[PDB]
Design a binder for this molecule. Structure first.
Ligand SMILES: [Zn+2]
Ligand SMILES: [Zn+2]
Length: 52
């Protein structure tokens, strides 16, 4: 299945790291589900991206 996806790219306007607590900046967002976060959430992420 298409697991998580990571493409280093800046967003369009503004976002928010659901893992941390404040906005999201040019980091890593999954372009298949629409996930977004910094390096604190590359491995700390528990359930990988397997939504549907
Ligand atoms: Zn994802
Ligand atoms: Zn984060």
């Amino acid at each position: 299945l298409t697991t998580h996806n990571f493409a280093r790219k800046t967003f369009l306007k503004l976002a928010f790291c659901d893992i941390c607590q404040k906005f999201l900046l040019n980091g890593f967002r999954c372009q298949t589900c629409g996930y977004k976060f910094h390096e604190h959430c590359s491995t700390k992420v528990p359930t990988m991206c397997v939504d549907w």
